[PDB]
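Lab notebook, page 48
Experiment: co-folding of the full assembly
Goal: obtain a model of how the components sit together before planning crosslinking
Operator: M.T.
Materials (sequences as entered):
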Amino acid sequence: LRSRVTDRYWRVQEVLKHARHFRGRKNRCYRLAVRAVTRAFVKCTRARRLKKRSLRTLWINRITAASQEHGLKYPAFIINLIKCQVELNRKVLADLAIYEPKTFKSLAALAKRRRXXXXXXXX
Amino acid sequence: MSSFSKAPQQWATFARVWYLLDGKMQPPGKLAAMASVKLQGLHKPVYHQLSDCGDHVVIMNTRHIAFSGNKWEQKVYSSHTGYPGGFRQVTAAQLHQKDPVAIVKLAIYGMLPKNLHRRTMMQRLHLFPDEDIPEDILKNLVEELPQ
Amino acid sequence: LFAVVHFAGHQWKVTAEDLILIENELDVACGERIRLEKVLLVGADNFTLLGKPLLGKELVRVEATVIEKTESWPKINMKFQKRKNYQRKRITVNPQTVLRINSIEXXXX
Amino acid sequence: XXXXXXXXXXXXXXXXXXXXXXXXXXXXXXXXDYHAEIQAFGHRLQETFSLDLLKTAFVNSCYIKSEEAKRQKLGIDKEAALLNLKDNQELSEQGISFSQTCLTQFFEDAFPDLPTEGVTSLVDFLTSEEVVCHVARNLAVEQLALSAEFPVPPPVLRQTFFAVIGALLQSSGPERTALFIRDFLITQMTGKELFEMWTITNPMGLLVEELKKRKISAPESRLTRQSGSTTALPVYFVGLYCDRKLIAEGPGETVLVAEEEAARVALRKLFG
Amino acid sequence: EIYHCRRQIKYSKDKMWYLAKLIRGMSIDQALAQLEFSDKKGAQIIKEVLLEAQDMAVRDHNVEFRSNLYVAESTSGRGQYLKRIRYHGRGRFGIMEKVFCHYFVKLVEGXXXXXXXXXXXXXXXXXXXXXXXX
RNA sequence: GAUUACCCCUUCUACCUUUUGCAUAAUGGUUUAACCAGAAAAAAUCUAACAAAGAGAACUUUAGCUAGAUACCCCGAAACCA
RNA sequence: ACAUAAUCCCAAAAAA
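Observation: model returned without errors.
Model output:
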């Protein structure tokens, strides 16, 4: 004949060890701890998936701001960068949009230059 | 300098800059958009959502605002109380004849995101029907973008 | 004076003395000195050089040193489906490599 | 077995409310021998010589005094460790002197435009006890250090570190040392603190001294503009110039602090 | 430190806690007077506990000055419960639980110092300026 | 996830059972501990023994025969009879 | 022309 021994108590101890910092019975009771842990992991996956989206949106906002400071909008800047064969990511572009206004000013100048040259070649 | 292991860039926080916006015939709610952009701080490359880096916007001559179309008499502002049948309809005309600074403010009040930061940035907004600005004794930056 | 490189499908802003972690392994022994390409170069005299779709190999260079190969803190990934009795728990540890940027070379043409 | 895991859990839970002091002899699990440590020390670093001086470098007076004390107490036998400390203090003496000379040479060659006061300040900060001891503890020298009383206290690790320095000076010569130390210290600094501790008293006046010494021109502060804020902090735009040529410009909350920061930026500007 | 404890005494823990928090932080004299003229079932008991604590403080610890003694800590725990049968209507019996309270008193020498005063303007001007710089 | 050694902001419709479909205002649960509900080899697949024979006086057999190993859980009536 | 507080998801806007 077997016994329950320390197995269940150790599993509960582990779950509750992962249940620390939780609020109320969820950091005390085992069942609510598990129920909260599942949700915690699902939210971990989902938020780690949407983190890139949030960061991307934030970067787009920053670059949009820095662009609007120079008189042009975000999409025009993007198009100009595409036709300038610039594969630079929006993260580094935002970092330059913050710390190094000179580089972004140069890119904006080249952007307006390409836009004016295209508008003059089309006419 | 130095940067370590995939981190977003925000240091601490900075000081907001007070701005001035002119009245006289600019479309209502069309100004509220960019004023909400300045309120959120979306015009700053250093912008952060949680940090609330938004600035302080002061607009003047709100009674000189001009709404196009027939919307003057046709716009109905609803104010309802807890009491039954306490539904109140106030036209833009009469509201302008009474409390004009409310109108534009309401146009801003729907632009901002909800919860805390809404009211937080709402306290950064001040409107006056006529021009008297003791706060102009304090030097501020003036931005002109008429429509 | 700073540079912008690209590795492992990710672009990074590199400066002297900086420590940058890159995904997994570079297949390079620890202590060795390696060279990286250049997407962008910006001089603090406000003099910028941007080539497409790459910069000059003869014009500019970037040399860094590998400190070691570490492992990031374990991430718990769990998939759960409602009333399908579907639960999958997987602990994933992402491999990383510590790179110490030493010399950013810029020469005149 | 459940008994071994209950005993391991009870020991691991007993160590939470009780913290034992760190011991130097029981620190390393494997047997600690002199030759093993100096061998690894020779394999890691480029060149290592004078094994006797190297061992002596990690020897402190406290261990000797304690040892002799135990010798007198027990009274079993008598041995003389006396030569160790006497040989160590000399290496430390020469070590300090040559360190001062070497660092002075470094600040002289690297920054020729740096005034004497700046040199003195940077030397005082670079030779400071806290920083050097921090570098020591970061290099895990405390593991190779031998202290009877306690491993932790700075007077041990610092003197030990300087003894190691002097040992490298005698054994490996200057050429190697110049490689070693110069690498670490610079990497440690990294901050603006270098010129900040020299700015702790009358930044403006110091700038006056520097300008009067070099270009012989009295600095003038003029407010170029003001953008006020009553709520948090007001912003004043303060220019600083000499002979109608603007040296610097900067914002400030108060006139005093603004002038301080302007004088600081101008101070580091004339550093080059 | 002078510790004193009373166990297996039957009184409401929630009610005794009212007079327990009352003398916490307070000096021996003020606590004595309070417990003396305080009206409740816990007043007498906690008065006895305090008196015994003072007797132990004087006799065992040989304290020079009685004025240097104050109440540092006071707490009330819950002991075993006595289950009794409360007869109700329609042939139903409810369970009446008679509770217990274990009273613990911890005394420390020296003058009592407690400051609950907090300046609003200073704390605001400091916390705001420190939060804006972080 | 960010962020400070704490929090506000942003990203998300309890579990289980029963169902075409439940966060569902369908079902079960105060919490915790412990107790508590898939144990049957004929033919077959598979691992070995020997082979026109296997198998401990019993049966099978136009490659069989012998042995081992693999799949079919609990609680509940209203009532009947002595 | 239906029966609790409005707009057929905020505020507004215009006619690549």
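Interpretation: Residues 59 and 127 of chain B are 5 Å apart (CA to CA).
Next step: discuss with group before ordering constructs.
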